[PDB]
Amino acid sequence: STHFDVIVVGAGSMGMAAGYQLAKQGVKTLLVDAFDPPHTNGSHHGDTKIIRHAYGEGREYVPLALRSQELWYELEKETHHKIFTKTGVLVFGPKGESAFVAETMEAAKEHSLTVDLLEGDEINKRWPGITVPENYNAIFEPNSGVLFSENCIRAYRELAEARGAKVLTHTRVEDFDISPDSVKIETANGSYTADKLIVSMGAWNSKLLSKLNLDIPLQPYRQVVGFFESDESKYSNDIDFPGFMVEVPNGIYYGFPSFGGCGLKLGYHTFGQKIDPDTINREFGVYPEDESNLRAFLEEYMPGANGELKRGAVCMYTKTLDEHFIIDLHPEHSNVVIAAGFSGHGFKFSSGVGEVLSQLALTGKTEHDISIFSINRPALKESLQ
Template sequence: MGTHYDVIVIGAGSMGMSSGYYLAKKGVKTLLVDAFDPPHTNGSHHGDTRIIRHAYGEGRKYVPLALRAQELWDELQKETNLPIFKQTGVLGFGPSDSAFIKEAIASGRQYALPLELLKAEEVSKRWPGVRLPEGFHACFEPTSGVLFSENCVKAFRQLAQEHGAALSVHTLVEDIAVNRNFVQIETSKGAYTAEKLIVTAGAWNGQILSKLKLNLSLQPKRQTVGWFACDESLYNDSVFPAFFADTGTAQYYGFPSFNGSGLKLGRHDYGQVTDPDQINRQFGIYPEDEGHIRRFLEVYMPQAAGTLKRGRVCMYTKTPDDHFIVDVHPAYDHVVMAAGFSGHGFKFSSVIGEVLSQLAVDGKTEHDISIFSVTRPALK
């Protein structure tokens, strides 16, 4: 492995590995540096599965990116034998005044997405494992579904290396020097230089970006998910969709049971503030690790509220407005960053990799990423 590259990528998780693939595919001499050995269980991409939604409750500006991300996932599937995507459809439900559900529906209408609107009784008739209270409504998007997150990272890694990308694992970044025409990073395995730098280090972005005199409002949070024994005839992936729910007081997301794994569930809007170097990864140390998600199942999916089969701890890195940061460094036009994916970023990692590769090589991207500006008022 050499010491000089066209582009160095710090952080080879979902966003970083994707960008490494798209860079290497263009013939760009690329070095990916990661503190661990991806895919791994220390960041935000483990736990088997992630939802991809196209109609988007977080804001309709995300829809074009979600659709492009889906195209790229479909292309990735053609390049690998690993399962990447399962079209389970995605069900969303909540009270009639839920702003999140309303925005998902509005975004679907604006972009003419296939989206079915359902009343509570229609949901229960179609999926007998769901019990919704009177006054709830739902939307179902049949063309969306589930990404196998660790397989996605594995596939990007394999293909990036096949295209010539270098990968340095178990490598800590100790310092960064930005010069006029190049950058230099000092690592636990030596020094490397490149004309361009991409920083996408997940929960460690705050630490890395502070070395570049950029202090952003990024808050890592400890999150938990659990897999529960369930009636497989009601909740297996051949008959049950992925889902998200706004109960009026909390937000949840979940997955059907794959190969008898059990129904997987997490709470989106709750988690303990943490330091990524100090996080306690033991599931169950807090009563709410299981308590919150079990109570949801008891109310809305009682036949999935069986024995906890396993639990996992991961991290979100939140911004104040829950929008991403994807931009060029305001002081260094040869430094690009992607950060603060706020618990809803993985589905976009294919297109974010494409965006980062374009910003690094061309200084611009074909995609509208204005909502992700590093200089927006919410980050100050």
């Protein structure tokens, strides 16, 4: 018998940030999650995530990245959990052969970001442990870095709960009932109503948005990461080894310096298995490519970080056809906000997205420019049932 102002379904990266923004304003909020965030069944575990400002996926993401960076610094001051370390982020690739490196460079120029440009041997010299061909160029962003994702979610949850937000864990939302003046969710643990709904179920958006009469192509992918024993005199965060996202002939890779001897962490971005979030095999090593795709990169570009595998993790990306996000009101219901398809690069923006989602839910509009994330854009291929 408890009505809420707002209900957030999926209290992960995006939902928990929204819950915190709403709670902070005194909005009576209920967050419902299938597990107990932060957990290891969605897209936010694996300990760390890169935050970059000069944006290779699109210069139009810069303001949101800069706003998110400021919000992460604010969160750092508000909690005892560690949130951000300024490792800097290095982007490199073959000169003239990487659209990713080119747009990162254009994005930095267009928004006057602070970056260092270097090439070939200058890269190897500046960061012992990296070995790239002489025809490679790079752009280094010293002020971006690494976020401790599980800590971010845990901190937003503690702060939101302290202000009255309620979080119903281990509860799967199974259906929705939307009316012009209210929303209702159905779960095995009971039904709940509110004035507004925010839907942010991550990989499960690909299976449950149909319950809101939405037919949007969303493909979940199994993406693994590995931590490798490394030469700490070269790859440690203590000796300024940077976070990185680079483009090589066979694709894009991203990584993190070793923190407190945990080993260098690496992931292969461009390849992953197409899967269903409810049947995905979350054990690292069950496919030979899990470990082999990573060592293929390490032995060539960071030879001293190709030691024993210390830990593996299996997480998911949910891609849209254009790999841009979906953040918008439901086309048929202004009282329903959708956050989906972060396509493998949404964590860094979760603080800013939480702000956008709270504004959309409370006012139906946002001060941020989110036109490129419209649920009505052609490149998405969106429609109703």
